[PDB]
Amino acid sequence: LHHAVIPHGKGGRSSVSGIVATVFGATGFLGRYVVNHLGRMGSQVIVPHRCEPYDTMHLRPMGDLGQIIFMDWNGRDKDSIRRAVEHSSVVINLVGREWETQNFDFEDVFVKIPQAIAQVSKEAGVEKFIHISHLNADIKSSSKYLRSKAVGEKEVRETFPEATIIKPAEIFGREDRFLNYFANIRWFGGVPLISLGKKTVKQPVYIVDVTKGIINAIKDPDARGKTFAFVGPSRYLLFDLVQYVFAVAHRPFLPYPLPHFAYRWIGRLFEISPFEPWTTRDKVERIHTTDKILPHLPGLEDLGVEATPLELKAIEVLRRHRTYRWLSSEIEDVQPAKTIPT
Amino acid sequence: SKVKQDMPPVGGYGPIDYKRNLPRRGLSGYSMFAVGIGALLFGYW
Amino acid sequence: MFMINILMLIIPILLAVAFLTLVERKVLGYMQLRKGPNVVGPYGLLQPIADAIKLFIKEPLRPATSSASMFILAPIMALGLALTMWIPLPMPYPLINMNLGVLFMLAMSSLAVYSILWSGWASNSKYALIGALRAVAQTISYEVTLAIILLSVLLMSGSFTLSTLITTQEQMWLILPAWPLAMMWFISTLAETNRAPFDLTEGESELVSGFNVEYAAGPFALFFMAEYANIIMMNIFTAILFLGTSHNPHMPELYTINFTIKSLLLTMSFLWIRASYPRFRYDQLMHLLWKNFLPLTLALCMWHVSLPILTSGIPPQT
Amino acid sequence: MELLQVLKRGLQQVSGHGGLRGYLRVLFRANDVRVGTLVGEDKYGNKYY
Amino acid sequence: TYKYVNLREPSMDMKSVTDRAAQTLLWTELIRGLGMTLSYLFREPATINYPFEKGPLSPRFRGEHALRRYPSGEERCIACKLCEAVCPAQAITIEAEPRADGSRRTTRYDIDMTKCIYCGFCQEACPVDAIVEGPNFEFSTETHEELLYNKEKLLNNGDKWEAEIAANIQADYLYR
Amino acid sequence: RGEYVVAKLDDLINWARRSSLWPMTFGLACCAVEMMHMAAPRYDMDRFGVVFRASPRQSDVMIVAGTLTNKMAPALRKVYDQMPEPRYVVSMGSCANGGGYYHYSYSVVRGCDRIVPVDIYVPGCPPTAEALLYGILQLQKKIKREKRLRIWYRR
Numbered sequence A: 001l002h003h004a005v006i007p008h009g010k011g012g013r014s015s016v017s018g019i020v021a022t023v024f025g026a027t028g029f030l031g032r033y034v035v036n037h038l039g040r041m042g043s044q045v046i047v048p049h050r051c052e053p054y055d056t057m058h059l060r061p062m063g064d065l066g067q068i069i070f071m072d073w074n075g076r077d078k079d080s081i082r083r084a085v086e087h088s089s090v091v092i093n094l095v096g097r098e099w100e101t102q103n104f105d106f107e108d109v110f111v112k113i114p115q116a117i118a119q120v121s122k123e124a125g126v127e128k129f130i131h132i133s134h135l136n137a138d139i140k141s142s143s144k145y146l147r148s149k150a151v152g153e154k155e156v157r158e159t160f161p162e163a164t165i166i167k168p169a170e171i172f173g174r175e176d177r178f179l180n181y182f183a184n185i186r187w188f189g190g191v192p193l194i195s196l197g198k199k200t201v202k203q204p205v206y207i208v209d210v211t212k213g214i215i216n217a218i219k220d221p222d223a224r225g226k227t228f229a230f231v232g233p234s235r236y237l238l239f240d241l242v243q244y245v246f247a248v249a250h251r252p253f254l255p256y257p258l259p260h261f262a263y264r265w266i267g268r269l270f271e272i273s274p275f276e277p278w279t280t281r282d283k284v285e286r287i288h289t290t291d292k293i294l295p296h297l298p299g300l301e302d303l304g305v306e307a308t309p310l311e312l313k314a315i316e317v318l319r320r321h322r323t324y325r326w327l328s329s330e331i332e333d334v335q336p337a338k339t340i341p342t
Numbered sequence B: 001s002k003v004k005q006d007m008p009p010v011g012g013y014g015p016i017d018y019k020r021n022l023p024r025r026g027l028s029g030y031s032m033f034a035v036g037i038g039a040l041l042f043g044y045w
Numbered sequence C: 001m002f003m004i005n006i007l008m009l010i011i012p013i014l015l016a017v018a019f020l021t022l023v024e025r026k027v028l029g030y031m032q033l034r035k036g037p038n039v040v041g042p043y044g045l046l047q048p049i050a051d052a053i054k055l056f057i058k059e060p061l062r063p064a065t066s067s068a069s070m071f072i073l074a075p076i077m078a079l080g081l082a083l084t085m086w087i088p089l090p091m092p093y094p095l096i097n098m099n100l101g102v103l104f105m106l107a108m109s110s111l112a113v114y115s116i117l118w119s120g121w122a123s124n125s126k127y128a129l130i131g132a133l134r135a136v137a138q139t140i141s142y143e144v145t146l147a148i149i150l151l152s153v154l155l156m157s158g159s160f161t162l163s164t165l166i167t168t169q170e171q172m173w174l175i176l177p178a179w180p181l182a183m184m185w186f187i188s189t190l191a192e193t194n195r196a197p198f199d200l201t202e203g204e205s206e207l208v209s210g211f212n213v214e215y216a217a218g219p220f221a222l223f224f225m226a227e228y229a230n231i232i233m234m235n236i237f238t239a240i241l242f243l244g245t246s247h248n249p250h251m252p253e254l255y256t257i258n259f260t261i262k263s264l265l266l267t268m269s270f271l272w273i274r275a276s277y278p279r280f281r282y283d284q285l286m287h288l289l290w291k292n293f294l295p296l297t298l299a300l301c302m303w304h305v306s307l308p309i310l311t312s313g314i315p316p317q318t
Numbered sequence D: 001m002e003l004l005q006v007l008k009r010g011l012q013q014v015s016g017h018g019g020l021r022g023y024l025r026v027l028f029r030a031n032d033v034r035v036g037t038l039v040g041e042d043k044y045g046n047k048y049y
Numbered sequence E: 001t002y003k004y005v006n007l008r009e010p011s012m013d014m015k016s017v018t019d020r021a022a023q024t025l026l027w028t029e030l031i032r033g034l035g036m037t038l039s040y041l042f043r044e045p046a047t048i049n050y051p052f053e054k055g056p057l058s059p060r061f062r063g064e065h066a067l068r069r070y071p072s073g074e075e076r077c078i079a080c081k082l083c084e085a086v087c088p089a090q091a092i093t094i095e096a097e098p099r100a101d102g103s104r105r106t107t108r109y110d111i112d113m114t115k116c117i118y119c120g121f122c123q124e125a126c127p128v129d130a131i132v133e134g135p136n137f138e139f140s141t142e143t144h145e146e147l148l149y150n151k152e153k154l155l156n157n158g159d160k161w162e163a164e165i166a167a168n169i170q171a172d173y174l175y176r
Numbered sequence F: 001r002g003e004y005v006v007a008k009l010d011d012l013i014n015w016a017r018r019s020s021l022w023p024m025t026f027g028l029a030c031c032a033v034e035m036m037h038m039a040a041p042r043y044d045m046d047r048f049g050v051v052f053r054a055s056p057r058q059s060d061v062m063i064v065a066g067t068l069t070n071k072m073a074p075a076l077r078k079v080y081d082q083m084p085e086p087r088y089v090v091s092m093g094s095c096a097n098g099g100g101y102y103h104y105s106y107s108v109v110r111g112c113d114r115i116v117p118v119d120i121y122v123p124g125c126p127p128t129a130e131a132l133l134y135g136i137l138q139l140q141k142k143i144k145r146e147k148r149l150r151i152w153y154r155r
């Protein structure tokens, strides 16, 4: 934090925030909001990308001249990771996938890449490390996604002890895979649900809430070495959450129960797609997994962020799924879902 | 030396046309209709 | 062997449409002191391939306000009917030899307007709607006149069979006895194909892109493909009507060569006319075909019903 | 007959470009098969006509 | 003096009326327009084969900036800041100090090529022909940062285009 | 190898896109006059396969030729968002690059890159019609280097 890393300005795009951040996986859902918030205050952002430069274009307006720097990196190349972090004061790890490719398994992107980044960051002298785990991560889950998340969350602690590990619940937003996933089930007629969605409880959180918590953790000096659980203000049943989704979108809602084994066989069929699968056996498990209640972990309120209710910010996500008949329906037209009081 | 400048030639420049010049063409109205009817009569026959 | 015959019809039509786009871009270029496509392939011979591939790997989007079923049906209807106008064409042997070929093409032409009306209405955009209602106005302008013009030419031929027009014009072209009808037929085909100076349903300078303003990618290509396949088809119809070619049963190839050239030159004239004239107003088009053509078309319909009778030259019924 | 002179000029372009390989190279590299007097060549191989 | 553009009366003699009737019915004046575009089809197009043929320019062309040197190799700029003061767009930023040998030289010479309006005032104001607009007009970039030139970029432009810049000045300095 | 075949398909689609660029008919200020001269006979952008189309939905390129004001900024992003992908933006002139002569104005957006992403910057006030045509040819070579399918294959 020498002379060039002293804050200046009034928090604008042409200010100097003093933050030099390397955001891995910045081309995805949770990464476009983090870069947007960092560049709003005038931060130096390094964005190592694996994909075509055409797919990084939406990130370019997010910063003043020279503030967003793009590098090409490989998850299995330890030298590329070092080039992208050796000048940074904070490293943010957002790498993840909801499916498995021929080249990267769940444990390749949740156990190995997170550990490789953490090790190189410590060897490079990086001061802050922010790792995004999952709320429902544990070694004894039915999902490799969550099983691998728990392992990765442990390797990071052993490599970067001062890391700040954040464990969000399912995140809903515009470019999400949670509310859009449920709405797009309408193509298949009915909405299958394991146990008819009556035995699953979900506590979704808003993307801006997660984005403001990560930014606060960077600036807050007491977030080092502390594990946070970013969850929403209300707990819903999966049946009520999905029913509310179809109510906002004004689409017919025709649920029907489906045995857990049957929903896996269907998921196996969809996994054959050589592109982004519509659904996988892992997503079915994740969707039908009760969100853990971790009272021992600090939450968003401990970083100064007020959790946004789903109702206030669900129409902005689901207005796209309505027909011309129901595009203009107002926010106050759909009664709120039923919550699970403590 | 002598002053050298971008100047017109000693005798000036040649004439430059600017007026509209749309030449008269074609046959007369009588001739065109005469040719038109003659084509029809041959076609009918 | 009939399925092969259909493929030997639709597939060449699409290739003809693809390279008519190149011909138009270069013909207009040279009439505008330019060159046109000469980089993508030698003399721009690969330009149609690039444009086709570009559009079909581009994102197609349905407007949020659109009626999805009508939005997708319309481009299908335009191309499907565009290819259907070709099956009764004698060149010199038709694919589907219809006894009422002339009437079949009229009905199909009228049905193909709804691909414009429904595309514009399904778009749910003001510019798409305005262009669609110009199609209603434009079809009200020529449809009545275009039918009587055909009727006057069939009173010298004998029937509605298109193959019979080859027999009618065996001694002489029909453009000599009916050049007044040929003039009003030619300008009526420009209106029917939505071509300049009657390109009002699209009207780039007035309506951005008209009825197909919301269409993009592949769906836009079908409207483009149908429009150009209609220019060639209508110019083939004009050649058969007024520039009939002599048919030798033992050398049918010689017919196609002469018949093909007459259609190209009539097709070039469409490109020639687009580069020479401004655009009508869609209310002036109606007055053109109702106050000038229609009075003369009715007079020439009376004349061509009386002329065979008063000269004992009524054509055979069969 | 200058109509024949047009064809000979078109054929001289084939011979003026060093054969058929050269004629096609310039056609597909520059979309232009004209032949002009050579003015010079720079150290990078660029030729000026 | 003036003249009427559309004050005319058509002759009403029968031959003239019939000539207009033929024009209305036979579309004579619409076929002249066809004849005019037909002639253009047979005229040689005016299209040059870019990038192999380039449109003509003149020595006064105002293109990409460059910082020049003397024949000795010494920089011509002596940090007078006249170009900075006259720049209409405030595209020039200069800082100077005594050099190790005592000379008056700039430690900063930045031109924001996205503020510049390529007007030529800076080269008109320079007393020692240090800053010039060269003949280069092909320097498009893929990023906004590549157009914020500093003294190192501008000196390289001078060392790059000197063979051409010095000749263009030679052909025009007697008009300045 | 399978990465060789995708590379050839990647070349094919890349060729189809840079050979059929259709700019949106979108001009703002003096820089649009030099955009017309590119379509004029001398340069004839149409011979490269570049054709203007008025509808944003039938366009592949947005050439921001002229000054961008705060009143016009919402409209520019709207017609950009409505272009189907893939879409490219070419910033023409100093006004659209960094505000140009009006950088310090209360009603001028300091660079169109604050509103939309930009692929090629053409400097000049105005750039010559031969400088814009150079910029479009640089865009084509930038599309030739895209390897979408060789990156999908390696996922």
Ligand SMILES: NC(=O)C1=CN([C@@H]2O[C@H](COP(=O)(O)OP(=O)(O)OC[C@H]3O[C@@H](n4cnc5c(N)ncnc54)[C@H](OP(=O)(O)O)[C@@H]3O)[C@@H](O)[C@H]2O)C=CC1
Residues within 6 Å of the ligand: A024, A025, A026, A027, A028, A029, A030, A031, A049, A050, A051, A052, A074, A075, A093, A094, A095, A096, A097, A098, A104, A109, A132, A133, A134, A135, A167, A168, A169, A170, A171, A177, A178
């Ligand atoms: N429902 C949710 O969104 C939840 C998110 N999380 C976690 O937050 C992080 C981001 O989530 P989200 O944005 O929604 O998912 P996205 O798919 O939208 O983002 C994934 C990012 O990681 C990159 N990535 C994936 N695999 C690799 C790989 N082998 N090598 C390099 N980069 C790779 C991607 O690069 P590219 O796109 O260029 O291929 C992309 O930038 C993840 O760690 C996720 O587990 C945890 C709780 C809830």
Ligand code: SF4
Residues within 6 Å of the ligand: E083, E086, E087, E088, E089, E090, E091, E092, E111, E115, E116, E117, E118, E119, E120, E121, E122, E123, E133
């Ligand atoms: S050319 Fe004009 S605007 Fe550009 S740097 Fe020189 S004085 Fe400033």
Ligand code: SF4
Residues within 6 Å of the ligand: E076, E077, E078, E079, E080, E081, E082, E083, E084, E094, E122, E125, E126, E127, E128, E129, E130, E131
């Ligand atoms: S006017 Fe010339 S000498 Fe003065 S500061 Fe500018 S470049 Fe240097």
Ligand code: SF4
Residues within 6 Å of the ligand: F029, F030, F031, F065, F066, F067, F092, F093, F094, F095, F096, F100, F101, F124, F125, F126, F127
């Ligand atoms: S950059 Fe120059 S030519 Fe372009 S709009 Fe601005 S002042 Fe006008």
